[PDB]
Assembly symmetry: C7
Homo-oligomer: 247 residues x 7
């Protein structure tokens, strides 16, 4: 789960705890990453719905234009290709929490649909006129200023406010450098756990080399550098020579 050390991150987890015990929609802003989903589950496991299902969907990763079809579901013959009936992600997240990752990639028409789901607390599959009563807690993320996206006319203003009741800005890695070392060691361990290998120590100069890199790719880039260093050290003591950043 969430492993931090920087004071700004600790403050952000503190806020995450306050909103967790409620049913408010959480908007996780900041650069795109995987932490956002690490917090989403954290919020879930801290919410009164910890035993409920946790469903995640990335609105910027679904090919063949099946974002709409995945969210709301569809009946047999709702569109060219719909060979079967299929429950939406909202249905699978009944009594639990759904995560709409990268929500800023929804077209204006899809937002108008999503708005109705939030308002009516009911969902209807594509090609269906039957509504489904919904008890689902909604989380969402965005790597861009939604307020300006509303101004640009690419996002609904009404939907914007309904989702920004409790925004949390999960910052880049360079703005929380105290998180780098705990995160680095965490990646080393979980990768050693995959292969039954003992976790190796990490050199001081290696750490200093990591702390002083701006990390434009954030956690995703850190995971690469670490995994790369583990290859170089052959799962052994990693030193500054094993740390190859874009420098």
């Amino acid at each position: 789960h969430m492993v931090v050390a920087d004071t700004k991150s600790l403050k952000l987890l503190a806020l995450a705890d306050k909103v967790a015990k409620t049913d408010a929609n959480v908007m996780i802003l900041g650069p795109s990453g995987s932490g956002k989903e690490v917090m989403s589950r954290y919020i879930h496991n801290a919410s009164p719905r910890k035993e409920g299902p946790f469903i995640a969907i990335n609105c910027a990763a679904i090919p063949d234009n099946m974002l709409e079809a995945t969210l709301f579901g569809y009946e047999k013959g709702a569109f060219t290709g719909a060979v079967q009936a299929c429950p939406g992600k909202f249905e699978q997240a009944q009594g639990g929490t759904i995560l709409l990752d990268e929500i800023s990639e929804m077209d204006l028409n899809l937002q108008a649909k999503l708005l109705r789901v939030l308002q009516e607390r009911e969902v209807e599959r594509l090609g269906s006129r039957k509504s489904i009563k919904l008890d689902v807690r909604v989380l969402a993320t965005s790597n861009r200023d939604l307020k300006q996206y509303v101004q640009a006319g690419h996002f609904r203003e009404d939907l914007y406010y309904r989702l920004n009741v409790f925004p949390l800005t999960w910052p880049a890695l360079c703005e929380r450098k105290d998180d780098i070392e705990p995160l680095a060691n965490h990646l080393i361990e979980r990768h050693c756990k995959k292969l039954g290998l003992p976790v190796p120590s990490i050199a001081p100069n290696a750490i200093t080399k990591l702390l002083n890199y701006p990390w434009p790719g954030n956690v995703a880039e850190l995971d690469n550098v670490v995994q790369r260093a583990l290859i170089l050290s052959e799962n052994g003591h990693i030193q500054s020579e094993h740390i190859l950043l874009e420098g």
Copy 2:
């Protein structure tokens, strides 16, 4: 309908006058929930009080189903119409219908609405049969309709038919005396909905709310208030709990 500003009370005074009549009411101003509740205020003060109240947001209907929802359709009137379905005008029989954000209707859809208003009857899509209509019409626009007409995006004849009695529900910053009662209203109905006790708002917090221009109006006030309730852990809302934009 929670108001307190003297200019808002004047507006409710006008609303009480048209309520007694069957006149088309156009509620102007910025988009919001108020235009929706001020329309239902009129209904409950109208001779059609006990009648049905139908609302439709022309800027919120997905899949281009605005026309199909208003007038209804017969089976197979368009690709996807797998059943018969009455229009919102039919559902508003003997009562009131609200055409929220009416400026979103295309010129063709305006021509159909015009026919409905003048002939007091409606026809479903893919239907030749007219249905006699006894419906009081309310509408809403966040645009200057006259400027919209002159821009050639709105029918002039339809404009005058809907603009016999325009009420302009202003922005929240030009009716600041409504802000404190509104906030307490928003807190209450949110707490009641969640089965929680209603907290009060500290004097400093009120001052903080009154001096914000509210570019998002009521929709933003509900935001701030719901956020404050989370920060206050459902306790009394202090100035520290009110985050506006920074």
Copy 3:
């Protein structure tokens, strides 16, 4: 029907001249409902007064059904033609038809109308059978048709055939002596259809109406009047009850 201005009376005097005949009357001037009441006046003053009077607005028919309603259509003449249907020309047999806003016809629709006027025959879309017509034709336009012809949007041959006896029904500000009698008529017919006793207008209210340029003409006057009746609560309309966009 309800005029008092000397230039309006002189126009109705001209209306009686053509009424006796079967000549095509072109009614020019601002887009209004007043044009239809004069065309009714022409009909009721014509030897076809006992015949039918059918009106059609060429700028108010949705779903591109202007051609379909004028000429009629057989079953399956177009995708949607689910039945046979007589045109507006057939219904006006032995009487008078009013082609309101005739400047909205596409050049192709004009060529078909020209065919009807010349041969005194009509044929439904889908049909090759022509129907002998005995119909007197009236038309309107808020547009300089001569200018429209030069702009290549209107047929020159059709123009001259309809411009035998052009009558220009002027704007409301160019016939202000009609304003006061018209205002009382709008009050009377509105109150009567709502079962309310008819109120009169205060002198100050009259002067206020006479000195407004009326960019919306009779359509706008009806708005202001109905608005005043709401404000006056069906009492005597005072100067304060008259809210125009000054």
Copy 4:
């Protein structure tokens, strides 16, 4: 038909009398009007085919793009809409005269078909390979300088030469003011005769008022002014006040 008095118009009828005796194609030039057809009928009744049929078609007045279909005819199913077999206008004008009014409205493809009709003296209906022998004399009109229209590439040069064997330019009404008074009297007469009314006289001042108007609408406009004067005079003596022109 025909009512002239101007010296330049009398010469033009004199020319019409010469081609009438022949089978030559006549191109009637000048501004569009009814006079174009009444001279075509004058030629026909002065022609050896005077007992033959006279067929007229306005190429600029046939709706639904039925120009080609009306001229050549069509068998059942030649195009989407052909629910029957139908003879062409050329077939109807067999042994007589056909009038192609405003011929400059034909597309270059339609011209190519008309060309082969003039050359081979045969016509084929749309959707038919069966050719029909034709004994038809051809007349045509145009409000356009066909030579300029040829040079512009909108008209076939070869067709231009077959049709402009004997051009006759029926001028604007202002270039033949001596025709105005006889023409006005003709209109007053035929209207009153159509209603069984006695023909009224026309004041000298009314005549002079008509003579000094340029008539941009030519004969078509004159007919309007005359009718309007009859309406105003109540079929009575037309005076210099029943003549409403422009102002």
Copy 5:
């Protein structure tokens, strides 16, 4: 057939006699005129195929884009409208001569099909894979510089050289004035014979009037002026007064 008198034309006919005796493809260039296809016929009847068929097709006059279908022929159903099988123009000109008039109107694809016909000396109908063996001599014309047309990418270079073995340029009427008087008389004769009328002569003053006109329409215009003159002269002797030129 050929009615010439100018030494310029006589030298061309002299050249025509040489190729006639051979099977070489003749390219007749010069302004578009009926004049050519008289030479094409002269070439044919002076050729060893004088008893064979003579088929002429004008590539710029075939309506409804039926150039390719009439030249190659089709089987039933080769295109929308083909309700039967139909031999091409090449098949009809078997053992004789075919004339491809205005060959510069063929699109690059049609040209590629014609090229293959010249090489393989066999043709296949549209919608047909069976190839018909041919023994046809090919003649062609063009009113434009084919070389320039090749450089403009509107004509195949290989096809150009196959057809331009023996190019004969049939000049404008003004560049061979001594042909005018004999041509004029021939146009009067064949027109007067066509209508069963006695053929008249042309006055000397009328002759000189014809000789000093540049003839931009060439012999299509000369045939026009003549037919118009015969109308005015009432089939009598043509005087200069009867000759109305466009100038």
Copy 6:
């Protein structure tokens, strides 16, 4: 058969003899002509695949976009028009040599297919997924610089290197004047033999006229001049007067 005399031409035939013994792909460059095919035929007859089939296809002469269809072949119903099965040019060239004349006319997709054919030594018809083992030597031509064509992104680089293993640039006729006279005589020869005529000689002055013309049309243009001269001389002695160049 290759008839040359220029020292630069003899060098290319010397090179051609070296590759003929091998199985390498030969790219013949220079202006488009027929001499490129008679070199392919030469290379074939000098190759160990001499007795094998020689199949030639011009990629710039196949109408109706049937280039891809004729090369690879197709099964019944591979495209709208494929009414039967049909073997490709590669199949017909089994155990022999194929000539891809003007290969620069292949679209990038068709090039990617040809590349696979060269690599895997297999071909499959359109609409078929069964592949056919190939034993075919590939020769190709191009009237343009393939390197610039690759740089222009209109030709695959990898394919360019597979085809330009042994490029031979067959120059224009002006860069090898010593070939003109032997070529011209050869043309006079074979053009006589097809008619059963005795071969005539060509005057010294006439030869000199040939040598000093730049021949922008090369061999194709030379053949025209020769044929034209034979027509003018009536298959007799050719003099400088019979030689009409574009001058």
Copy 7:
């Protein structure tokens, strides 16, 4: 593999360290045969050396069958699919697949590829059934992927998945000590597949080959070599047989 240049030897040394793992390898540099020779080296040095090795060039598949051949497809999944067909991933089960020139995939194919890497399972086109995959992934680009991501033509998330262990296989001029061993190698395999004795390369020819920049790299060297063998009549290759760009 040939290799003699210190640069290439260090790259192969790095290849050995990543071979023993299941990490995705990114082989960068100009397009050539050498990339797949390294991808095969990585395989034969990996614990999956006895497993299947599947190669697919994303820039060489005709008729847009890149997505189809990679993922596989059920019958009639697209207009052309007349049969079921397993994808390249299915064929590379328990072994290694090489996605050659991966920068040619469109953003959609990249999204599909991403899910395959994440979930370690694939589903054919027109199929809902997911196939569990034990497949090691190698990839190749002749393009700066980082820049390609910034240009918005490549997914950033997919980029970092593949950029765990990037290896840049340089141009032939940046590793000249490989030229001579590579040259003799190309002669050897070309002569052996043609049933000819292998010729040697003269000292003067070697230096002539060493001082050419090789913009076409190995593909050009193989080209130049094969041409030399023809000129040498399969004899020893002299500098006179080396035709480059003179």
